[PDB]
Swiss-Prot record:
Expressed in which tissues: In the egg white and polymorphonuclear leukocytes.
Family per record: Belongs to the glycosyl hydrolase 22 family.
EC number(s) given by UniProt: 3.2.1.17
Localization of this protein: Secreted
Function: Lysozymes have primarily a bacteriolytic function; those in tissues and body fluids are associated with the monocyte-macrophage system and enhance the activity of immunoagents. Has bacteriolytic activity against M.luteus.
Stated name of the protein: Lysozyme C
Gene name of the encoded protein: LYZ
Alphabetical list of InterPro entries matching this protein: Glyco_hydro_22, Glyco_hydro_22_CS, Glyco_hydro_22_lys, Lysozyme-like_dom_sf
UniProt main location, coarse: secreted
Domain of life: Eukaryota
Length: 129
């Protein structure tokens, strides 16, 4: 499923992401935009053989099991395919664990390079929330 900007903001809010660990809603919408273009089905393989899944591009080396990443830790205890569902619940529960890991949202390279320090409030502007 390809989410609309405000539709995703609303889903994120209902799922308790607004200000989770101090990160406002605009931060999460901005990260989803640049990581997957709001597409739950997005996947991308890395040079190390691992693969990134879903809206938040969660990595198979540490967070989920895809059956083809030697030494995956599967910290979110879920098959990576679950992260591609139109129901964002799994993606959200796993992202919450990732952001609590100690590096905050820096864990997401696109967030660090394209959202961090920018006017992220623009991402939820105009939305009924």
């Amino acid at each position: 499923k390809v989410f609309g900007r405000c539709e995703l903001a609303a889903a994120f809010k209902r799922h308790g992401l607004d200000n989770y660990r101090g990160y406002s809603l605009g931060n999460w919408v901005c990260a989803a935009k640049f990581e997957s273009n709001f597409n739950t089905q997005a996947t991308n393989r890395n040079t190390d053989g691992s693969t990134d899944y879903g809206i938040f591009q969660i990595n198979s080396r540490w967070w989920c099991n895809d059956g083809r990443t030697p030494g995956s830790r599967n910290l979110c205890n879920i098959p990576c395919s679950a992260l591609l569902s139109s129901d964002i619940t799994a993606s959200v529960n796993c992202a919450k664990k990732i952001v609590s890991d100690g590096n905050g949202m820096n864990a997401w390279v696109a967030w660090r390079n394209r959202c961090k320090g920018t006017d992220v409030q623009a991402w939820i502007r105009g939305c009924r929330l």
